[PDB]
């Protein structure tokens, strides 16, 4: 349903962005309210579609910097800025988007995924796990495992 | 507080400002009294709050959303990429293109206020009850918007 719509929107958009090496950062509010970092962004309150997500992230456009925040089956804002993890040490492949995805999963139960601006690699942060450089299939399975209940 | 109308004109002006210098084609139609629900069905659903940033991101060329009409209704972007009827009036001439014909076309069959940014010249335009005022300047196009949504 709404999570299944969400997942297909995510997979199709990363499918476009990953080979093109377009940077992307999408955080999905789960139990804990992300409202604090939501307020830092451009309100959209838009329906989730692959097309809108792709348009948001097109390089050097007004909306593509910062995080898209998904709240209750809607793109709540774009251009939100997340807490940075106190680690860095991210040489090649990994960048500030990954650092922000990590720093937010340290203070909430958000599901955040990243497409690397440098390599097009797909990453997910959730719980205390950073799963980096997934395949489109591995990405999609993680999404379903985390977002759909049971099956 | 700022009015949903007022914010929406501010959004329109800022995006045209950005888009017109760069010859970025835009085609935005605002529903008024006559329902545009037939053309709304042909587009990609957004149901998004109106901002200059979203509109600029919608019309960036070679993106999934940019071709066709953004359709405003109840101060939201109902859809993008919608298809409006092209005018059959032969006097439409060149210089103006599909976007302009779609805008003219929709004003023939509805009270909608539509405006256009030419993809080749950057020229701002506006249609409303058949009438078609083109090559406006930012101040022109702005004052026009205000009267219609007074």
């Amino acid at each position: 349903s709404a999570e299944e719509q969400m997942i297909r929107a995510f997979v199709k958009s990363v499918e476009y962005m990953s080979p093109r090496k377009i940077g992307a950062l999408v955080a999905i509010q789960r139990v804990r309210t992300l409202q604090e970092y939501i307020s830092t962004g451009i309100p959209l309150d838009a329906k989730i579609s692959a097309e809108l997500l792709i348009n948001i992230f097109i390089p050097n456009t007004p909306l593509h910097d910062g995080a898209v925040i998904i709240k209750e089956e809607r793109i709540a804002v774009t251009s939100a800025y997340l807490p940075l993890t106190k680690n860095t040490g991210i040489s090649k492949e990994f960048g500030t988007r990954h650092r922000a995805a990590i720093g937010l999963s340290e203070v909430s139960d958000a599901l955040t995924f990243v497409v690397s601006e440098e390599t097009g690699g797909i990453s997910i942060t959730y719980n205390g796990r950073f799963k980096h450089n997934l395949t489109l299939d591995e990405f999609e399975t993680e999404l379903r495992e985390i977002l759909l209940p049971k099956e | 507080p700022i009015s949903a109308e007022e914010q929406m004109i501010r959004a329109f002006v800022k995006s045209v400002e950005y888009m017109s210098p760069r010859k970025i084609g835009a085609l935005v139609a605002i529903q008024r009294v006559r329902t545009l629900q037939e053309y709304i069905s042909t587009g990609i659903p957004l149901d998004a709050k109106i901002s200059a940033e979203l509109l600029i991101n919608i019309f960036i060329p070679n993106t999934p959303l940019h071709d066709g009409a953004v359709i405003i209704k109840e101060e939201r972007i109902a859809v993008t990429s919608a298809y409006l009827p092209l005018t059959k009036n032969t006097g439409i001439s060149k210089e103006f293109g599909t976007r302009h014909r779609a805008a003219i076309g929709l004003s023939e069959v509805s009270d909608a206020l539509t405006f256009v940014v030419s993809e080749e010249t950057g020229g701002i335009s506006i249609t409303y009850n058949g009438r078609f005022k083109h090559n406006l300047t930012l101040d022109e196009f702005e004052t026009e918007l205000r009267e219609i949504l007074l």
Binding site: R8, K12, Y16, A50, E51 | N62, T63, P64, H66, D67
Partner: peptide
Amino acid sequence: ERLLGGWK
């Protein structure tokens, strides 16, 4: 389902 458009 697949996306279409030639922006592709």
